[PDB]
Ligand binder design. Structure first.
Ligand SMILES: CCCCCCCC(=O)OC[C@H](COP(=O)(O)O[C@@H]1[C@H](O)[C@H](O)[C@@H](OP(=O)(O)O)[C@H](OP(=O)(O)O)[C@H]1O)OC(=O)CCCCCCC
Ligand SMILES: [Ca+2]
Lengths: 117, 277, 11, 82, 433, 42
């Protein structure tokens, strides 16, 4: 998207010489892509690329399909055993921790610190 | 001279037994914790049957593991060619020695020797590293290497080494898969010595006769089916001696051991050799 | 040396 | 159909495909692209037994292994009883 | 057999008994009655019977003869092999071969066709030729028997698998193609298992065997044959993958962790790295490693993309000047790389997808240069700079491909490859609607 | 199954022999007089 954003910036005009606005201008290409606001209609009037834009969109959509595919692939395998292993950490953490709520565990922390020094 | 396409020496039959062992021990290679002797030459052809494809292959690996020497005829024709064969493949795949003793007069081509080289009346297998050619009588058709082999075996048996975990003398085992001709005489002579303990393979030969056995009438029925041409062509003066000799072997069955073709269990050779020893 | 030794073996 | 095709295993395909990337760089000169122009020009200027025995040895054991498994497949020692 | 032997007229002649016991398939009886007998075999008597055993498809008797002793190399004279191929090669299979060469021609298939045609008119590697003769007619047992005698076992198995697969692709008749495919599967499994055993026994020798270019079995080694036949299982195994890894890191020893190498790479003079007199030797070994080359090329590609963006977007006006010159040198070297790959294999270059991505990008760059260079019309510059913009944008899509090396995301990106075709069809339908 | 599918294929291509590849047939189709095709006097 960043690459095609700089492509769109090039479409808009020819000359860039402002170090302050260079960062801002390219930042707007993601802005155009996100909420679907583009000046391409005006850009064409300003003056092969039209097919290139459609090819860009076609390439982009495969990207979003990719997560669907691999999410399916990884959700297929069993996962309950992983949680059974992971449950150990939560139980272990509280046993070491003093059996007092956090708002009042400050006193317990201070008491423990006293012994160390 | 050395042989390369590998050392060969020529010595008299009457030559002292000790000098051979002293030369081998002093600088060519280290002391042997084990030794194996193979009988051969009864039949020029050797059939690579399923039974024989395993026993000798395991035996050569065992010899390499224990550093054992292998004493064979040393000719390309016969079993020794495969004993050589397998030895070479072991090196291709810590070091294994292979000594082959034959008759000097029985060799078709002899070249004096730096090292004379001959490239292909008996031919000599290339695989065996050291070749000893006994010359008791020049151009003598009868084979005399058996006597020198027996003398060397007797000396080696009486040799004492502290190494290993065998009381006193180093172990000796004779493998008898070949049948008849020099094989039976060699077995008789070796058994005459107390130390040797013979082993009989499962192949079809007079060795099979000895395996089946474990007076002359009891054993006459044997060897008839195994060796029909041999008995038929053999004169009565030879058949009577052949059947006489078997009694000496069967007198002391405790030393000898039998490898049965049946047992498909692996490392049967190791079990047989260890039991015999 | 070795050459001298070898000659002895044959005798 | 994305679900249908993502279900089947795909790791082996990548394992096969990884070969091309490794092969490409071995032929390519071991110099970065900005400086590989000199290497390209230099290359252009020029234009204008025992292992087999070991393999055989390895194959021998393979044959023995394939045969012994079939031999041991039997659960009875029928020839002993016969 | 009994009525014959008892007569005793031909009893002295073992040859007649052996021939009769060969006509009727009885190996066990023949081996015991004839071969066990202590009779001389000069290996010249057996040749005549061996020829017929080969013709009449008696594999067990062939194996028995070989076991009892017969020099195959001596037996396989140049006169025997030509007769073998010419008369005993089925006219139906020759028909399949002609069709396969015409339709599904391949690097190894053309060589096999040339070899077959050679033995139809009149070092030698006769054993491999006989193995091919057996394999081409879907003679399973005979091919199995001959494979053992072959010098190159794994390579021969892989080549046979490839040839059988190519034959199976043919559609002249279903049965022969199916049989060939089934046999090819078995030969592939053999080629896999034997190499696994070899690698288990010895690392260095197995690696040497892998890269061992053959003496014109098909003009290639086992790795190339596996790739060409798409033998994914053979190339996807611990041994081959480890061999490839030992090359990717090159001189650099493995299991040094990526961050340690990268820190040295970005900081050039470091000495705290482990790899498999002269200090320059360490730096030479480090630099020549292909992995470092790939990383450095990725960094240079990123820099090139930034420079291309800056020149295209910013201060691109009238005469191109130094920013252009510097920018265009890199694109020219990019073209020369594709030219090298074309020289190596144009057809495989066309097969590759990323290669086509590269070609279209370089073409677009040249198109962009064309408009500005001639400068016939002032408005032409404004109209044509869009081509340069499109060249820049296309290069970035190629940049994406490098993410496959990590292998943490390589399966996903390789999946996207075959995903894109389905998506393009499934979206073109909707576009038509 | 292989047999029935092969029978149907032997009908779909009809007189045209199989394994001639699609592009070869299509090129002749769009160019009518060609003679470089293989199929199962006048
Ligand atoms: C910087 C721009 C964006 C960067 C993102 C670019 C992302 C990118 O390109 O790949 C990241 C890569 C990760 O490497 P990564 O550790 O995942 O490599 C694999 C990993 O180490 C596994 O653990 C290894 O074993 P296994 O497979 O588990 O069995 C496997 O082979 P092996 O150990 O078994 O033999 C390794 O292949 O690190 C780079 O430096 C690549 C050069 C990039 C150049 C970066 C220069 C800074
Ligand atoms: Ca390329």
């Amino acid at each position: 998207m960043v690459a095609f954003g700089v492509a769109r910036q090039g479409i808009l005009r020819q000359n860039e010489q402002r170090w302050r606005w260079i960062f801002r201008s390219v930042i707007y290409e993601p802005y155009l892509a996100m909420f679907g606001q583009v000046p391409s209609d005006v850009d064409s009037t300003t003056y092969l690329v039209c097919i290139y834009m459609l090819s860009t969109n076609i390439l982009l959509v495969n990207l979003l399909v990719a997560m669907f595919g691999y999410t399916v692939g990884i959700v297929q395998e069993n996962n309950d055993q992983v949680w059974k292993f992971q449950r150990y950490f939560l139980v272990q953490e509280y046993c070491n921790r003093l059996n007092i709520p956090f708002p009042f565990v400050v006193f317990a922390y201070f008491y423990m610190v006293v012994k160390k020094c | 001279g050395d042989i390369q396409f590998g050392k060969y020496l020529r010595l008299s039959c009457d030559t002292d037994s000790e000098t051979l062992y002293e030369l081998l021990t002093q600088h060519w290679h280290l002391k042997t914790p084990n030794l194996v002797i193979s009988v051969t030459g009864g039949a020029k052809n050797f059939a690579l049957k399923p039974r024989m494809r395993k026993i000798f292959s395991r035996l050569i690996y065992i010899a390499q593991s224990k550093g054992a020497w292998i004493l064979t005829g040393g000719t390309h024709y016969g079993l020794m060619k495969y004993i050589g064969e397998v030895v070479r493949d072991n090196t291709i795949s810590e070091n294994i020695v292979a000594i082959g003793i034959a008759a000097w007069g029985m060799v078709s081509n002899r070249d004096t020797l730096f090292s004379a080289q001959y490239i292909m009346l008996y031919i000599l297998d290339n695989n065996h590293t050291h070749l000893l050619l006994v010359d008791n009588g020049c151009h003598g058709h009868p084979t005399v290497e058996a006597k020198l082999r027996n003398q060397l075996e007797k000396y080696i048996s009486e040799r004492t080494s502290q190494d290993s975990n065998y009381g006193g003398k180093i172990p000796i085992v004779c493998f008898a898969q070949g049948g008849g001709r020099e094989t039976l005489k060699a077995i008789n002579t070796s058994v005459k010595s107390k130390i040797p303990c013979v082993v009989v393979e499962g192949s079809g030969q007079i060795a099979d006769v000895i395996a089946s056995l474990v007076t002359s009438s009891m054993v006459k029925e044997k060897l008839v089916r195994f060796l029909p041409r041999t008995v038929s062509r053999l004169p009565e003066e030879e058949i009577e001696s052949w059947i006489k000799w078997l009694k000496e072997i069967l007198e002391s069955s405790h030393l000898l051991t039998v490898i049965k073709m049946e047992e498909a269990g692996d490392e049967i050779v190791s079990n047989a050799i260890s039991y015999a020893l | 040396d070795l050459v001298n030794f070898i000659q002895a073996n044959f005798k | 159909y994305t679900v249908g095709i993502v279900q089947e295993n795909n790791d082996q395909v990548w394992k096969f495909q990884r070969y091309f990337l490794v092969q490409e760089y071995c032929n390519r000169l071991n110099i970065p692209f900005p400086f590989v122009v000199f290497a390209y020009f230099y290359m252009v200027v020029k234009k204008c037994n025992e292992t087999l025995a070991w393999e055989g040895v390895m194959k021998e054991n393979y044959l023995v292994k394939i045969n012994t498994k079939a031999n041991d497949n039997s659960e009875e020692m029928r020839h002993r009883f016969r | 057999y009994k009525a014959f032997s008892t007569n005793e007229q031909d009893k002295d002649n073992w040859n007649g008994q052996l021939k009769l016991l060969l006509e009727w398939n009885q190996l066990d009886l023949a081996s015991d009655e004839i071969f066990t007998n202590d009779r001389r075999w000069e290996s010249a008597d057996l040749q005549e019977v061996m020829f017929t055993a080969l013709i009449k498809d008696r594999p067990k008797f062939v194996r028995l003869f070989l076991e009892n002793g017969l020099n195959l190399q001596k037996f396989l004279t140049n006169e025997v092999l030509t007769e073998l191929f010419s008369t005993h090669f089925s006219t139906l299979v020759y028909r399949n071969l002609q069709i396969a060469k015409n339709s599904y021609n391949d690097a190894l298939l053309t060589f096999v066709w040339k070899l077959v045609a050679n033995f139809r008119r009149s070092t030698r590697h006769p054993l491999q030729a006989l193995f091919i003769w057996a394999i081409l007619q879907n003679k399973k047992e005979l091919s199995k028997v001959i494979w053992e005698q072959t010098k190159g076992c794994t390579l021969a198995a892989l080549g046979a698998s490839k040839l059988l697969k190519t034959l199976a692709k043919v559609k002249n008749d279903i049965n022969a193609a199916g049989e060939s495919e089934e046999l090819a599967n078995e030969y592939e499994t053999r080629a896999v298992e034997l190499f696994t055993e070899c690698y288990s026994n010895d690392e260095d020798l197995a690696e040497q065997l892998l890269v061992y270019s053959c003496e014109a079995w098909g003009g290639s080694n086992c790795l190339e044959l596996a790739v060409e036949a798409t033998d994914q299982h053979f190339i996807a195994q611990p041994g081959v993958q480890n061999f490839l890894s030992k090359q990717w890191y090159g001189e650099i020893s493995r299991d040094t962790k990526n961050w340690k190498i990268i820190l040295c790479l970005f900081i050039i003079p470091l000495v705290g790295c482990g790899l498999v007199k002269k200090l320059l030797w360490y730096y030479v070994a480090f630099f020549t490693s292909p992995f470092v080359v790939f990383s450095w090329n990725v960094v240079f590609y990123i820099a090139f993309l930034l420079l291309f963006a800056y020149v295209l977007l910013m201060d691109f006006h009238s005469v191109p000047h130094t920013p252009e010159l510097i920018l265009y040198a890199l694109v020219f070297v990019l073209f020369c790389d594709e030219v090298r790959q074309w020289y190596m294999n144009g057809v495989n270059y066309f097969t590759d997808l990323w290669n086509v991505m590269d070609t279209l990008g370089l073409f677009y760059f040249i198109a962009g240069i064309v408009f500005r260079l001639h400068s016939s019309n002032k408005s032409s510059l404004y109209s044509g700079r869009v081509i340069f913009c499109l060249d820049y944008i296309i290069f970035t899509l190629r940049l994406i491909h490098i993410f496959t090396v990590s292998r943490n995301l390589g399966p996903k990106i390789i999946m996207l490859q075959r995903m894109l075709i389905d998506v393009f069809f499934f979206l073109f339908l909707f576009a038509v609607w």
